[PDB]
Amino acid sequence: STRNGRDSQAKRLGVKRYEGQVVRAGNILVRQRGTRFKPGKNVGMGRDFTLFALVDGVVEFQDRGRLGRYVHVRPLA
Amino acid sequence: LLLECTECKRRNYATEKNKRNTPNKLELRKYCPWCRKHTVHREVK
Amino acid sequence: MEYRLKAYYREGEKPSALRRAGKLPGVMYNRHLNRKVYVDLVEFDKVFRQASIHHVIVLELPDGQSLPTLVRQVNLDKRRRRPEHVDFFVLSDEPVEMYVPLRFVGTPAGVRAGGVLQEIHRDILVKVSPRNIPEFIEVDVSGLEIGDSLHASDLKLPPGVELAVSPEETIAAVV
Amino acid sequence: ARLTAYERRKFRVRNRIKRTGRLRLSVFRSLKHIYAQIIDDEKGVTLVSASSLALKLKGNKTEVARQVGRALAEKALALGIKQVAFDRGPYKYHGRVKALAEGAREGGLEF
Amino acid sequence: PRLKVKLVKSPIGYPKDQKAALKALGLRRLQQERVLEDTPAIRGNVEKVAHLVRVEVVE
Amino acid sequence: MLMPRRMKYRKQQRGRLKGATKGGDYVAFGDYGLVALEPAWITAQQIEAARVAMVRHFRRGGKIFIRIFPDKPYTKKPLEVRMGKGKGNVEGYVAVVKPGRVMFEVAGVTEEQAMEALRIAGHKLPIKTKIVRRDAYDEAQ
RNA sequence: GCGCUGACUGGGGCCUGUAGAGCACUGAUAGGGCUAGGGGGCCCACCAGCCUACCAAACCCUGUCAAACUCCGAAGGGUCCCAGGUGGAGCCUGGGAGUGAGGGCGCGAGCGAUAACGUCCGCGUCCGAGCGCGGGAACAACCGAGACCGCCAGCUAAGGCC
RNA sequence: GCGGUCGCCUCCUAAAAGGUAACGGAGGCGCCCAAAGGUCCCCUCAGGCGGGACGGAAAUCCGCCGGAGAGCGCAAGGGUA
RNA sequence: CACCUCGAUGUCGGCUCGUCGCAUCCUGGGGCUGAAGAAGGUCCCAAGGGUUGGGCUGUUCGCCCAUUAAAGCGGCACGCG
RNA sequence: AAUCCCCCGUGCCCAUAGCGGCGUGGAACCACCCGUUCCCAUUCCGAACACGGAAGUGAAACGCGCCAGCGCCGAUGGUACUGGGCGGGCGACCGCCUGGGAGAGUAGGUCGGUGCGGGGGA
Ligand SMILES: [Mg+2]
Ligand SMILES: [Mg+2]
Ligand SMILES: [Mg+2]
Ligand SMILES: [Mg+2]
Ligand SMILES: [Mg+2]
Ligand SMILES: [Mg+2]
Ligand SMILES: [Mg+2]
Ligand SMILES: [Mg+2]
Ligand SMILES: [Mg+2]
Ligand SMILES: [Mg+2]
Ligand SMILES: [Mg+2]
Ligand SMILES: [Mg+2]
Ligand SMILES: [Mg+2]
Ligand SMILES: [Mg+2]
Ligand SMILES: [Mg+2]
Ligand SMILES: [Mg+2]
Ligand SMILES: [Mg+2]
Ligand SMILES: [Mg+2]
Ligand SMILES: [Mg+2]
Ligand SMILES: [Mg+2]
Ligand SMILES: [Mg+2]
Ligand SMILES: [Mg+2]
Ligand SMILES: [Mg+2]
Ligand SMILES: [Mg+2]
Ligand SMILES: [Mg+2]
Ligand SMILES: [Mg+2]
Ligand SMILES: [Mg+2]
Ligand SMILES: [Mg+2]
Ligand SMILES: [Mg+2]
Ligand SMILES: [Mg+2]
Ligand SMILES: [Mg+2]
Ligand SMILES: [Mg+2]
Ligand SMILES: [Mg+2]
Ligand SMILES: [Mg+2]
Ligand SMILES: [Mg+2]
Ligand SMILES: [Mg+2]
Ligand SMILES: [Mg+2]
Ligand SMILES: [Mg+2]
Ligand SMILES: [Mg+2]
Ligand SMILES: [Mg+2]
Ligand SMILES: [Mg+2]
Ligand SMILES: [Mg+2]
Ligand SMILES: [Mg+2]
Ligand SMILES: [Mg+2]
Ligand SMILES: [Mg+2]
Ligand SMILES: [Mg+2]
Ligand SMILES: [Mg+2]
Ligand SMILES: [Mg+2]
Ligand SMILES: [Mg+2]
Ligand SMILES: [Mg+2]
Ligand SMILES: [Mg+2]
Ligand SMILES: [Mg+2]
Ligand SMILES: [Mg+2]
Ligand SMILES: [Mg+2]
Ligand SMILES: [Mg+2]
Ligand SMILES: [Mg+2]
Ligand SMILES: [Mg+2]
Ligand SMILES: [Mg+2]
Ligand SMILES: [Mg+2]
Ligand SMILES: [Mg+2]
Ligand SMILES: [Mg+2]
Ligand SMILES: [Mg+2]
Ligand SMILES: [Mg+2]
Ligand SMILES: [Mg+2]
Ligand SMILES: [Mg+2]
Known part of the structure; x- marks a missing residue:
């Protein structure tokens, strides 16, 4: 017999809205494990590091080098 | 050790968690009741 | 001493077809130039x-010129x-790095009958001007006894130029 | 030694500010002088400036400071500006910086 | 100008999205010619099926 | 018998034999070499059957370089087969060898002497080979 | 009931860590040099102590390997926008089901022995339900091709033309 | 049948969205902390080298170099000065 | 492995009756021999025919007795209820 | 006002701005610096943090330059791989078409650029 045999549930992680999608206040934007997308303008980040639109708007991505990747919501939806 | 916090009178309040023998003491800390507002809140039972 | 081959020009004409044609694709470049060239394979071999990146190939090619090219890469396809593909580096006078073969001249030179010849490098990398190009390098070193290791400045250093360093290294020793 | 306590604590106190997204009232105190800008980030642009240098004053820098404080309100409040966030940068909020701050009232408020 | 696409080989046994393509060019049966505008979208589908189809440019 | 000391995981997946490639391939250490014509898992007990064929031909003389190494664990099910329960039981190790790679590669021996050794050495191998010499094409580096 | 929103396609953004490759990390690892530790062979037994045709840290040259390594990283794939796309398309509400034993083949993996008409997933296809037609001697699933009926008419596909 | 297994977390398998199987490869959980919690204010590692009584491979001290390989209560991953 | 057969494809061994294969036990023909002769060894050709009787065990097989030119090995639903 | 140059802030690009070596700056800015009464301070130490200063020095720090030993960036050609279409091999696997096309490596490149506001020069 085998002492192996487990695995855990898929956590269905990753990005839930991409650039230039129209979001709404509260929409969550990224589901993620560490801080690998840091919150930008109008983007909150919850205790599971999870990012959500603060305002209705549209989503843009920004790659700031050693500063990291950033998700902003650009208002006036 | 499951934990249950009384306060003074009217006895409704809220409950808690203590997994330790510290504090072994009367275990009392400040909190908000549903009727009056923010009283002493000791621990019973 | 002097190696002339050939060359030609190309723009379109898939290298698959050329290669199928007996002709080896390649490129021609230096600081001032980049150009697509092909040669005959059998000629080039x-x-x-x-030649072998130790010596200067003067190309030729049509609109006949003569270009002082060093070959700086050969890509062989691993299967066969x-x-x-070859790419030819054209010289013009600025100090440039390259590989100069070594010639070990002498007897075992110390601890004879018997030592260990033990050549570490068959070549060396040296910053050298196009004008004076040292086609080989004399290594005598009468000893070379047990426990001695030749580094860099213990080498001839032909009147042309200096090294590509680092001066601390090993070339031959006997253990 | 990479990236000193100075430049950490500096970032640490700055980054928090730049989050709330107000106008930033930045404060540079030197050994002689004390200067203050009011900056709009995302336009990357200074709006209203004040200093002991440009107002050519001296005499006891904590008192000088409060003066470049009242000086900044004045100039700034004039453009519509109210509600900023007080930088304080590497400095403990104390002394000369506390004073430019606590003289930066009557406009540019909440500190 | 425009395009003459004519179905020369059955889609039977080719992926569903290629089958979807011939629908977008409204080719329902073998040998059926269709003459439709040459534009980037009409071109994509015509290329996607290029192995089942025969094309010529036409006014 | 070659075999890694201190492995990180015993038992790794089989994976494919595709794509003759990836280094080795140019004869860096010696005067002559054995190059792989076809892909194979080549077994530690195969490599040492090649090594010894050659040292025997040099009468303990010469220099021999190997240059493939058996780091891939080979499992087997005991006899007693039945599919399941687990995976089980590493036998040997193999090195994966795709075409154009140089294994072995002798030096410090007369040409016809080494060429006879490499030919012997080759018969101990499951795939086809090619013997090679060394080249301008094997560059400098 | 809605009614242009559909599959597929064009352009544009964003997302990703595989094929390939790489060795910067985690490990593995060939040859050499230089070197702690050491087997030691031993010079003493006080610190001493010279040599390594054995181990072997680090370090440097050369040379590789990896599902649970990655300094890199394609093609593709996903999603939103704008356009084409009128289709036995799409969306919403409801009525009726049946199905929840699948199989072969291609491709990508695992298990297996780089066995099985093997087993287990993925993406595709066909048989299933097209054991109706043509090709493959014969032959569910390979090639050709989607059979409404009729004709002692024509052109072709695959495969063929003694 | 016997043996193993049965819920939860981490990684790989998994084919660069998601999801994805096998009696495929490996590991972990059934707790814990009144501070290991909130906030404000400071501070920045491991490691290497040189120095320094008892101090030894590493107790504490000083110098320099060290961008994160340390730490984050516990498995792994992601994250993080 | 689980593909036809569980609304039945009777299962070992023996006996009877064979037929086929040849990777040949014998007989026939060969090469090499570390083949003097005789007698072997090994390998090649060859399937026409032959290929014993007993003790023990349900045995196949094996061991043994006595012989022999030899006491062949396989297949045919481990051939044949 | 503008254009320029120097300094001080403060952003942006996020190493082509970095390490190292050399050189250079004190009028002004900035630093170190002078003190520790006072505010306020260091699990001890005004080291730091803080205040009051202004004699000195640009030694340290910083700013500006120069050098390619390192670091970092890096083509073009060519391959690998591959979306779609086809072949081949008992197989492991290979090849052709059409479109896309790395990684390493070679040539090279770089000792930053730039915005807003100050102070000073012209
Ligand atoms: Mg999982
Ligand atoms: Mg078909
Ligand atoms: Mg699709
Ligand atoms: Mg290879
Ligand atoms: Mg062979
Ligand atoms: Mg429409
Ligand atoms: Mg659509
Ligand atoms: Mg599209
Ligand atoms: Mg790979
Ligand atoms: Mg490595
Ligand atoms: Mg990988
Ligand atoms: Mg790159
Ligand atoms: Mg897209
Ligand atoms: Mg539309
Ligand atoms: Mg339908
Ligand atoms: Mg319904
Ligand atoms: Mg089922
Ligand atoms: Mg199916
Ligand atoms: Mg299935
Ligand atoms: Mg194929
Ligand atoms: Mg099957
Ligand atoms: Mg199969
Ligand atoms: Mg299927
Ligand atoms: Mg059925
Ligand atoms: Mg059929
Ligand atoms: Mg169908
Ligand atoms: Mg039938
Ligand atoms: Mg037929
Ligand atoms: Mg029909
Ligand atoms: Mg034909
Ligand atoms: Mg049981
Ligand atoms: Mg996935
Ligand atoms: Mg996928
Ligand atoms: Mg367990
Ligand atoms: Mg230390
Ligand atoms: Mg020390
Ligand atoms: Mg860590
Ligand atoms: Mg069955
Ligand atoms: Mg089955
Ligand atoms: Mg039955
Ligand atoms: Mg029956
Ligand atoms: Mg019956
Ligand atoms: Mg015979
Ligand atoms: Mg005879
Ligand atoms: Mg005889
Ligand atoms: Mg005979
Ligand atoms: Mg016979
Ligand atoms: Mg009897
Ligand atoms: Mg009996
Ligand atoms: Mg028996
Ligand atoms: Mg008998
Ligand atoms: Mg018989
Ligand atoms: Mg049987
Ligand atoms: Mg029978
Ligand atoms: Mg009977
Ligand atoms: Mg001065
Ligand atoms: Mg002076
Ligand atoms: Mg005092
Ligand atoms: Mg203190
Ligand atoms: Mg200086
Ligand atoms: Mg590059
Ligand atoms: Mg290219
Ligand atoms: Mg392709
Ligand atoms: Mg490149
Ligand atoms: Mg600037």
């Missing part, structure tokens, strides 16, 4: 056997180990 006979020269490159000899036959070269599938």
Whole structure:
């Protein structure tokens, strides 16, 4: 017999809205494990590091080098 | 050790968690009741 | 001493077809130039056997010129180990790095009967001007006894130029 | 030694500010002088400036400071500006910086 | 100008999205010619099926 | 018998034999070499059957370089087969060898002497080979 | 009931860590040099102590390997926008089901022995339900091709033309 | 049948969205902390080298170099000065 | 492995009756021999025919007795209820 | 006002701005610096943090330059791989078409650029 045999549930992680999608206040934007997308303008980040639109708007991505990747919501939806 | 916090009178309040023998003491800390507002809140039972 | 081959020009004409044609694709470049060239394969082999990035190939090619090219890469395709592309580096006078072969001249030179010859490098990398190009390098070193290791400045250093360093290294020793 | 306590604590106190997204009232105190800008980030642009240098004053820098404080309100409040966030940068909020701050009232408020 | 696409080989046994393509060019049966505008979208589908189809440019 | 000391995981997946490639391939250490014509898992007990064929031909003389190494664990099910329960039981190790790679590669021996050794050495191998010499094409580096 | 929103396609953004490759990390690892530790062979037994044709840290040259390594990283794939796309398309509400034993083949993996008409997933296809037609001697699933009926008419596909 | 297994977390398998199987490869959980919690204010590692009584491979001290390989209560991953 | 057969494809061994294969036990023909002769060894050709009787065990097989030119090995639903 | 140059802030690009070596700056800015009464301070130490200063020095720090030993960036050609279409091999696997096309490596490149506001020069 085998002492192996487990695995855990898929956590269905990753990005839930991409650039230039129209979001709404509260929409969550990224589901993620560490801080690998840091919150930008109008983007909150919850205790599971999870990012959500603060305002209705549209989503843009920004790659700031050693500063990291950033998700902003650009208002006036 | 499951934990249950009384306060003074009217006895409704809220409950808690203590997994330790510290504090072994009367275990009392400040909190908000549903009727009056923010009283002493000791621990019973 | 002097290696001439050939060259030609190309723009379109898939290298698959050329290669199928007996002609070895390649490129021609230096600081001032980049150009697509091809050569005959059989022609190139006979020269490159000899030349081999140690020596200057003067190309030629139509609109006939003569370009002082060093060959700086050969890509062989691994399956058949036959070269599938060459790129020729054209000289003009600025100090430039390259590989100069070594000649070990002498007897065992110390601890004879018997030592260990033990050549570490068959070549060396040296910053050298196009004008004076040292086609080989004399290594005598009468000893070379047990426990001695030749580094860099213990080498001839032909009147042309200096090294590509680092001066601390090993070339031959006897253990 | 990479990236000193100075430049950490500096970032640490700055980054928090730049989050709330107000106008930033930045404060540079030197050994002689004390200067203050009011900056709009995302336009990357200074709006209203004040200093002991440009107002050519001296005499006891904590008192000088409060003066470049009242000086900044004045100039700034004039453009519509109210509600900023007080930088304080590497400095403990104390002394000369506390004073430019606590003289930066009557406009540019909440500190 | 425009395009003459004519179905020369059955889609039977080719992926569903290629089958979807011939629908977008409204080719329902073998040998059926269709003459439709040459534009980037009409071109994509015509290329996607290029192995089942025969094309010529036409006014 | 070659075999890694201190492995990180015993038992790794089989994976494919595709794509003759990836280094080795140019004869860096010696005067002559054995190059792989076809892909194979080549077994530690195969490599040492090649090594010894050659040292025997040099009468303990010469220099021999190897240059493939058996780091891939080979499992087997005991006899007693039945599919399941687990995976089980590493036998040997193999090195994966795709075409154009140089294994072995002798030096410090007369040409016809080494060429006879490499030919012997080759018969101990499951795939086809090619003997090679060394080249301008094997560059400098 | 809605009614242009559909599959597929064009352009544009964003997302990703595989094929390939790489060795910067985690490990593995060939040859050499230089070197702690050491087997030691031993010079003493006080610190001493010279040599390594054995181990072997680090370090440097050369040379590789990896599902649970990655300094890199394609093609593709996903999603939103704008356009084409009128289709036995799409969306919403409801009525009726049946199905929840699948199989072969291609491709990508695992298990297996780089066995099985083997087993287990993925993406595709066909048989299933097209054991109706043509090709493959014969032959569910390979090639050709989607059979409404009729004709002692024509052109072709695959495969063929003694 | 016997043996193993049965819920939860981490990684790989998994084919660069998601999801994805096998009696495929490996590991972990059934707790814990009144501070290991909130906030404000400071501070920045491991490691290497040189120095320094008892101090030894590493107790504490000083110098320099060290961008994160340390730490984050516990498995792994992601994250993080 | 689980593909036809569980609304039945009777299962070992023996006996009877064979037929086929040849990777040949014998007989026939060969090469090499570390083949003097005789007698062997090994390998090649060859399937026409032959290929014993007993003790023990349900045995196949094996061991043994006595012989022999030899006491062949396989297949045919481990051939044949 | 503008253009320029120098300094001080403060952003942006996020190493082509970095390490190292050399050189250079004190009028002004900035630093170190002078003190520790006072505010306020260091699990001890005004080291730091803080205040009051202004004699000195640009030694340290910083700013500006120069050098390619390192670091970092890096083509073009060519391959690998591959979306779609086809072949081949008992197989492991290979090849052709059409479109896309790395990684390493070679040539090279770089000792930053730039915005807003100050102070000073012209
Ligand atoms: Mg999982
Ligand atoms: Mg078909
Ligand atoms: Mg699709
Ligand atoms: Mg190879
Ligand atoms: Mg062979
Ligand atoms: Mg429409
Ligand atoms: Mg659509
Ligand atoms: Mg599209
Ligand atoms: Mg790979
Ligand atoms: Mg490595
Ligand atoms: Mg990988
Ligand atoms: Mg790159
Ligand atoms: Mg897209
Ligand atoms: Mg539309
Ligand atoms: Mg339908
Ligand atoms: Mg319904
Ligand atoms: Mg089922
Ligand atoms: Mg199916
Ligand atoms: Mg299935
Ligand atoms: Mg195929
Ligand atoms: Mg099957
Ligand atoms: Mg199969
Ligand atoms: Mg299927
Ligand atoms: Mg059925
Ligand atoms: Mg059929
Ligand atoms: Mg169908
Ligand atoms: Mg039938
Ligand atoms: Mg037929
Ligand atoms: Mg029909
Ligand atoms: Mg035909
Ligand atoms: Mg049981
Ligand atoms: Mg996935
Ligand atoms: Mg996928
Ligand atoms: Mg467990
Ligand atoms: Mg330390
Ligand atoms: Mg020390
Ligand atoms: Mg860590
Ligand atoms: Mg069955
Ligand atoms: Mg089955
Ligand atoms: Mg039955
Ligand atoms: Mg029946
Ligand atoms: Mg019956
Ligand atoms: Mg015979
Ligand atoms: Mg005879
Ligand atoms: Mg005889
Ligand atoms: Mg005979
Ligand atoms: Mg016979
Ligand atoms: Mg009897
Ligand atoms: Mg009996
Ligand atoms: Mg028996
Ligand atoms: Mg008998
Ligand atoms: Mg018989
Ligand atoms: Mg049987
Ligand atoms: Mg029977
Ligand atoms: Mg009977
Ligand atoms: Mg001065
Ligand atoms: Mg002066
Ligand atoms: Mg005092
Ligand atoms: Mg203190
Ligand atoms: Mg200085
Ligand atoms: Mg590059
Ligand atoms: Mg390219
Ligand atoms: Mg392709
Ligand atoms: Mg490149
Ligand atoms: Mg600037």
